[PDB]
Design an enzyme around this catalytic site. Structure first.
Site, PDB file in Angstrom:
ATOM      1  N   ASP A 155     -11.792   7.889   4.877  1.00  0.00           N
ATOM      2  CA  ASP A 155     -10.653   7.260   5.619  1.00  0.00           C
ATOM      3  C   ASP A 155     -10.064   6.213   5.149  1.00  0.00           C
ATOM      4  OD1 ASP A 155      -8.162   8.212   7.170  1.00  0.00           O
ATOM      5  OD2 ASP A 155      -8.759   8.253   9.117  1.00  0.00           O
TER       6      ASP A 155
ATOM      7  N   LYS B 166       1.043  -1.055  -0.136  1.00  0.00           N
ATOM      8  CA  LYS B 166       0.332  -0.208  -0.044  1.00  0.00           C
ATOM      9  C   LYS B 166       1.104   1.116   0.035  1.00  0.00           C
ATOM     10  CE  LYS B 166      -2.513   3.048   3.025  1.00  0.00           C
ATOM     11  NZ  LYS B 166      -3.692   2.364   4.409  1.00  0.00           N
TER      12      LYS B 166
ATOM     13  N   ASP C 110       2.132   6.223   5.681  1.00  0.00           N
ATOM     14  CA  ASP C 110       0.960   5.291   5.246  1.00  0.00           C
ATOM     15  C   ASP C 110       1.409   4.451   4.223  1.00  0.00           C
ATOM     16  OD1 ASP C 110      -3.025   5.345   5.278  1.00  0.00           O
ATOM     17  OD2 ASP C 110      -1.175   3.964   6.477  1.00  0.00           O
TER      18      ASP C 110
ATOM     19  N   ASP D  29      -1.510  10.046   4.064  1.00  0.00           N
ATOM     20  CA  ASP D  29      -3.425  10.484   4.269  1.00  0.00           C
ATOM     21  C   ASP D  29      -4.060  11.739   5.041  1.00  0.00           C
ATOM     22  OD1 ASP D  29      -5.877   9.218   4.335  1.00  0.00           O
ATOM     23  OD2 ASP D  29      -5.872   8.257   5.535  1.00  0.00           O
TER      24      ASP D  29
ATOM     25  N   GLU E 219      -9.718   4.391   3.109  1.00  0.00           N
ATOM     26  CA  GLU E 219      -8.559   4.806   1.176  1.00  0.00           C
ATOM     27  C   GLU E 219      -7.772   3.367   1.329  1.00  0.00           C
ATOM     28  OE1 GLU E 219      -7.450   6.305   3.674  1.00  0.00           O
ATOM     29  OE2 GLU E 219      -5.497   5.181   2.313  1.00  0.00           O
TER      30      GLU E 219
ATOM     31  N   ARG F 285      -7.377   0.349   1.685  1.00  0.00           N
ATOM     32  CA  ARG F 285      -8.084  -1.125   0.947  1.00  0.00           C
ATOM     33  C   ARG F 285      -8.852  -0.398  -1.139  1.00  0.00           C
ATOM     34  NH1 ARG F 285     -12.435  -1.472   5.460  1.00  0.00           N
ATOM     35  NH2 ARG F 285     -10.176  -0.401   6.819  1.00  0.00           N
TER      36      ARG F 285
ATOM     37  N   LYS G  10      -9.400  13.555   8.329  1.00  0.00           N
ATOM     38  CA  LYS G  10      -8.387  13.040  10.686  1.00  0.00           C
ATOM     39  C   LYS G  10      -8.402  14.424  11.099  1.00  0.00           C
ATOM     40  CE  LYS G  10      -5.706   9.405   8.107  1.00  0.00           C
ATOM     41  NZ  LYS G  10      -6.052   8.611   9.431  1.00  0.00           N
TER      42      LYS G  10
HETATM   43 ZN   LIG Z   1      -7.101   6.026   6.066  1.00  0.00          ZN
HETATM   44 ZN   LIG Z   2      -4.834   5.192   4.442  1.00  0.00          ZN
END
Ligand SMILES: [Zn+2]
Ligand SMILES: [Zn+2]
Ligand SMILES: [Ca+2]
Ligand SMILES: [Zn+2]
Ligand SMILES: [Zn+2]
Ligand SMILES: [Zn+2]
Ligand SMILES: [Zn+2]
Ligand SMILES: [Zn+2]
Ligand SMILES: [Zn+2]
Lengths: 490, 490, 490, 490
Positions: free
Chosen positions: C344, C262, C285, C267, C346, C348, C274
């Site tokens: 959030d 990923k 991330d 993010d 996101e 996946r 957030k």
């Molecule tokens: Zn996220």
């Molecule tokens: Zn993320």
């Protein structure tokens, strides 16, 4: 009391007082008594209107010293706003403006001439009663728990009301006393206004008036009656509860009007503690109590030829090692079991038991008065109280009263489709309804306890007090309820 | 439309359909058609009622297979509750129950005999109209944006409605088409239901019907009209706004009824971003738009003899480097300047320009429909729409409509003493009124723009959609609105 | 790489380096090399052990200057803890201690004799590999984006590792280069480590090695492949996305191992911004991407005899006026539609398209690696990666690898009774499962896309980086992953 | 300017103006001019003082009509408090009271005699300067973005100031013009007061005055100078940034005083979005810029004999798909790299580049003025500005200035033991210091860029504007700043 009132029939230019209050509209038209003064002064007022020194618009006051021709050395002219917009609210406003202008300074006695004005859909008596209430309200000063602070002693102490209706002055004074009484109790800090202090206070009033009565119940007595819902809420507090029962025997053997007021002397929320803000405002959570007591005081002073019973569950909602819990199921006096979804929805839990208890009086009408819900405040603001009932006639009677003295309520529905919000798996009914429709669902909860009664519910959470550390108990809805009782007595 | 409808006057026992739908009450008494079937089957129903196999309490059904004497191989018996308590709600709940029970499974065609039952204070026409709208409503399945997901193929497709008023059926079918339109638009994800798409869908409908007309404006056109409040909301979003104007000219010469629907296709809250939960439900914030468009569809398909204009401001309220910001002062179409206290109170900022716009049509009644306020949900719940107006006659017209079709509203006051909450130092008006009275002050805001108008406001925030990831757009208040227009066409 | 490594077989007392590194246990017993030095110095170490100057408890070191008999002017004695409790952890902690003690100061070259110590259940090869990775890991200093800040110049540059397995050293050095690569990429600020940059860095590495290959896709190319879920996440950001595909063809004909990492380079949470703390850590991330790329580097430099494909979706999740919004329904590459409950969640949504993509390679094992869920941190801590799969054999392969190198994982179930939490009314699947089971349902989501695959999922949210402004990317799980691949190459 | 001013030396009883303004103390003693009027009226004032009609306590006024002997038809008597306690504050409160009392109504011209009163430790010049600034300040009405709203036309337009120092009047008038400029700029909605507009307003002023000069830079120009910190803040917003540089060359050859004002025209907080309340007040976040520009205006109009450079970075801090993000490392003009711990600590990130810029001017004193920190509000309130510097002599110069004009500041330490709170692993410096010492560490941050400079920092967050929707920009600290410059010109 803040002010004393007399009636007065003098010619405005002859009145022997420190000041004459008169009116002028925004188009520079003068109130009648203002005209008399203008004559005596040979056009001095008109000269000052012309120059723009005397304003007529809403909120204006102008204070003038030694007009020729005028016995009083002062004239206060109050703006009355646009003449074509004059009515109830401008009139009440005008009167408050007058008193606020005279509250501090050299004027001890004044003549309020404004009562002479036509207020549409209102009579001379009403004009007098409102002169008294509004100006007394505006002169209120809290001092009960100042220690070393000196306050200002000057300014208005007595108001002469233009008119000759003695009875109207008497009913206005009695009302003003009720209002003051309710605002004092509301304002007292919670460590002084405990349940014990509230019951003593109410009893010491009852006991001075032939035909007024008090019965105070304690926890042992309430236990013996099965008031288990009320007692769950009260259990946490070191300040033990009272059931205050007040009677005025003015109606012979007629069935009584019965007022039931929420007297939570302080609300911490219990184990559902108030952490979101505004926990300091919670000395006002006994205003339903203060307010039905104030109405009792007005009713008794005005000697109204009716039967009145006032019931006030006086309870403190404290967080504590022996306080009731969310998810507890408690047994109401009626035998219904209640599941406490939230310990901070406890007003209805002391009210349900008092309302059951009130059935013994065989009420002509039963009206509970309560600072119940933030929801109602979201719905209607500080402006207007929420009213709920299953009896249209009663609802309309209370609406009409509020509208008449400008202490307004607004009806909300108790539709069946709201009721299932109070479903419970563990008890007969759940004490709260969810995120939405909270004013209404609290009303529906109450209605479970008033099915055989001609009942109504005033949610007064918005009207009863103002916000912030400077805010006070307003005394609402003593206006509305006293007027409702006057209507019942006519 | 999810179902096909026909009227049907066949004797119950001879109807050639897959299932006959009859009623029984909680006390075991059978609907007239139930009797016919009982009698055709020589007391089989009565036998199954005795043994307790056929319940008559609310919400219960029973599917019976191959009753001797009945052409239809199935009988569905729907519980009607206490015959004592029968009326609007129990009637509707029964139709819904019948459809839910048949929605999936072996039944394709069924005869609905339930329309025969007398509903106190409702005529036969209303029984039929309601039988179509409630059935179709219950039959709805959302499919537009499923992909690989296989969906359930069996179940009710055609409903024959016992009765003989073809105008009643046609009007029910028209209303249900409108409801469905509104629900599809509300349900669509906001990446599909952009302002552009909402404009095309509506124009496309309008273009298929003679006497119907659509006009779509873009931002340059709205710029030219000075709709600076609307465009401020719109600025931040890549999905550019539209003004959708639909006209139906079924009333020749007459001043039109004008509906103004809030078409916020998604609401992030903007710079005042929604951080506190519920943001995923803001695809329903165009339901004001969805439902006035639904009502348009209903008016056209029902060919009502009135002029109807429907204006929908279509705007996405997005957070962006060019988003309007709190404290901006924006110039509305009417020329009034607005201080933006909160970018999340943006519905009223698109409506206030649409409302000014709408004045060109010289309306007989001007009604806005909006998912405006959380406050109104706190006030009235999911159950009931908030209604506001300065014209009592118009307010009563809408309350009576919602009351007729059980798509309910409740009035909230628009009194002057609320107006001060909208004051501003930097503009003519502040767009929000603070913590309390939120639905009212939003109503008050709108009123600044409709002073010359016979106008009402419907806050449909609670009523327009259901909470949570499986809740859908309700279609409300198409029912109220269409019944309102039917009353104007009568 | 922060250090240089060589094998070294010199006798401890003759090694010509700035410092010899030896061990002593908590009970005063000396490592074999410590003995040699003691003996060369005629009992100096033993004397300093008696007096208490040389501690042998965990985490302690002692720097001794100019011991008679020893060519190196310094001896560092590292505490090994209770000889009773020696093993994996005490071994690694000791290597780390040795490097930390020498990182800054007069020592440039040192001989690490600690590899001699027997580690129960580990061979000599593992001692050597681990001596290189732990030392290099401890030597790391971030410098890329310092500007004026002068950094510390002295300290360890070269580590000679006692022992004689050159393949072990080469593999350690390869792994450490991979770890370093992953840590540099994770550590870089997101304004430098954009998706574009991450794609260039990887391509540039791939292009220097024969048998290694890189292909970079842009949005038009991903558009053409239908990666509509991935592109929805990407839309709002000015830093446009990439698909990084790395191939190593060291296994001739064989089906490849495919890693999917990923690569969210920052993010914001998107429209679901957030707001609740921790946003500044979302430069980590992309560690899923950093570490599969690290593993690529390790596989190539170690020249492992396997086919390895590494796919990294590289996307910045930004809040913007064109950001995807919650409740959008997006079309994934597999054709399944996804309801976005929260922007959030996101990660996946970029992985699910990369996973479908990856199917083209016909994998022997398909493993995604992601900083997926807060839930997994709550579940497993910083200590341990969450592992999920429907294939036990593959799960065990990865657990055993992490267990071998002390880069640990733990399995979490992917049972069916969790799948229902992902239901959707408006799409084939909802992208989030609610409050509980958050790591599992995220795993379940991914599983919708890998049903035909021998697939596993590694949630590396706790393991990939350290909290707070001085915590860096750990390099985990390059250790696990590379050891896993070594096992496949064996 | 809201009022016109003139000096006036007429005898009080002969002045031909609409109102004479005199003073009385709480103990009934009359100001000298009050005496003249009393005497001209043969003891009328003394009579009205006895009866209690003329109060002399703080904040009280009395408007008297047509006193025999006085040419002006009105006398306003302002209460001065206990003669015992007279001084700076009671003097200023009295001027403000006088203007407030006359702001609306029949008076156009008035003579202000209050300047006669001796203010301990202040000269006659200060009485005059202060009479103009406090009056003008009290007269201010915001009108720029009202639309339909009719505003109040009557009231004070011209104030004659008793006294005879024309330089004192001219300097007061200059200061008040500066204050007004600063308040208009602060008050303007951020959609009007963009960085572009703020640059044009200032350039336009500069271009009207010989010896004054403006230069405006855009982003390409700032790019070329390497102001990469400033431009990172600016990136996300559609309203592109400016660098405003104003020069006044009234000091020939001398090193200049250089003021650097923070011009954040709106602050969303950026990606670290303001979610916790108060976002609507961030139109005041350019008051640093507003007030150094005000001071510029004052210096120019007062024609002070000094060189003055004023640099204002003008930037909107917006949330967007191209907004800088937390954890970015940005390169400042000085070459130092900055780790962005929080995008909402962005003021210092525009100031630090402006400060480096400002070094070109070789300043005698370098003073930044910023609405920097919530911490400073917690520290010092609305009452008092936070002051920071490494040069005691410069700090004392500013404290004494603020103290002279009652526009106060208070020093906060910049000790070394605070510097460590700004450490960073990924850059030369971290832009925030954590929970405590927030105003200090912000001050410390700035100090990294002014090490070679005689520099001070003024945190004006509490002092620059008032809370709530009717609070406006105060104009503070133009008073302090101008008095500071007057001291340098002396
Ligand atoms: Zn996220
Ligand atoms: Zn993320
Ligand atoms: Ca953008
Ligand atoms: Zn409570
Ligand atoms: Zn309470
Ligand atoms: Zn909104
Ligand atoms: Zn909205
Ligand atoms: Zn900020
Ligand atoms: Zn700022």
């Amino acid at each position: 009391m803040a002010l004393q009132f007399t009636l007065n029939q003098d010619a405005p230019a002859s009145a022997a007082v420190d000041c004459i209050v008169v009116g002028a509209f925004a188009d520079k038209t003068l109130s009648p008594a203002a005209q008399a003064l203008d004559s005596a002064s040979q056009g001095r007022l008109t000269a000052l209107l012309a120059r723009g020194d005397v304003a007529g618009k809403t909120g204006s006051t102008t204070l003038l010293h030694d007009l020729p021709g005028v016995a009083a050395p002062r004239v206060l002219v109050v703006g009355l706003g646009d003449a074509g917009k004059f009515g109830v609210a401008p009139y009440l406003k005008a009167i408050g403006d007058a008193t606020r202008a005279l509250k501090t300074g050299a004027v001890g006695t004044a003549l309020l001439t404004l009562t002479e004005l036509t207020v549409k859909a209102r009579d001379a008596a009403w004009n007098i009663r409102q002169a008294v209430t509004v100006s007394d309200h505006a002169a209120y000063r809290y001092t009960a728990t100042l220690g070393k602070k000196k306050v200002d002693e000057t300014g208005l102490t007595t108001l002469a009301i233009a008119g000759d209706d003695a009875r109207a002055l008497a009913v206005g004074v009695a009302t003003a006393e009720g209002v003051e009484f309710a605002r004092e109790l509301g304002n007292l800090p919670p460590n002084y206004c405990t349940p014990a202090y509230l019951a003593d206070t109410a009893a010491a009033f009852a006991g001075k008036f032939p035909g007024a009565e008090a019965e105070i119940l304690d926890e042992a007595q309430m236990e013996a009656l099965g008031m288990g819902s009320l007692l769950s809420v009260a259990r946490g507090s070191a300040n033990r509860p009272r059931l205050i029962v007040l009677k005025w025997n003015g109606g012979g053997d007629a069935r009584p009007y019965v007022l039931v007021g929420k007297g939570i002397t302080f609300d911490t929320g219990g184990v559902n503690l108030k952490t979101q803000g505004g926990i300091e405002e919670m000395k006002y959570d006994m205003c339903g109590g203060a307010t039905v007591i104030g109405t009792f005081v007005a009713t008794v002073k005005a000697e109204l030829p009716i039967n009145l019973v006032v019931v006030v569950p006086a309870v403190e909602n404290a967080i504590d090692g022996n306080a009731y819990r969310p998810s507890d199921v408690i047994t109401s006096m009626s035998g219904k079991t209640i599941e406490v979804g939230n310990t901070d929805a406890e007003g209805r839990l002391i009210l349900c038991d008092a309302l059951t208890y009130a059935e013994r009086f065989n009420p002509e009408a039963l009206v509970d008065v309560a600072t119940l819900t933030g929801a109602c405040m979201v719905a209607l603001g500080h402006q207007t109280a929420g009213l709920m009932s299953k009896h249209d006639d009663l609802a309309n009677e209370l609406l009409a009263a509020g509208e008449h003295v400008f202490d307004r309520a607004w009806r909300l529905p108790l539709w069946d489709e709201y009721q299932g919000l109070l479903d419970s798996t563990f008890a007969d009914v759940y004490n709260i309804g969810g995120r939405w429709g909270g004013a209404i669902t609290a009303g529906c909860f109450l209605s479970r306890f008033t099915e055989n009664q001609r009942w109504a519910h005033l949610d007064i959470a918005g009207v009863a007090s103002d916000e912030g550390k400077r805010g006070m108990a307003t005394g609402r809805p003593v206006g509305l309820l006293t007027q409702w009782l006057l209507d019942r007595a006519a």
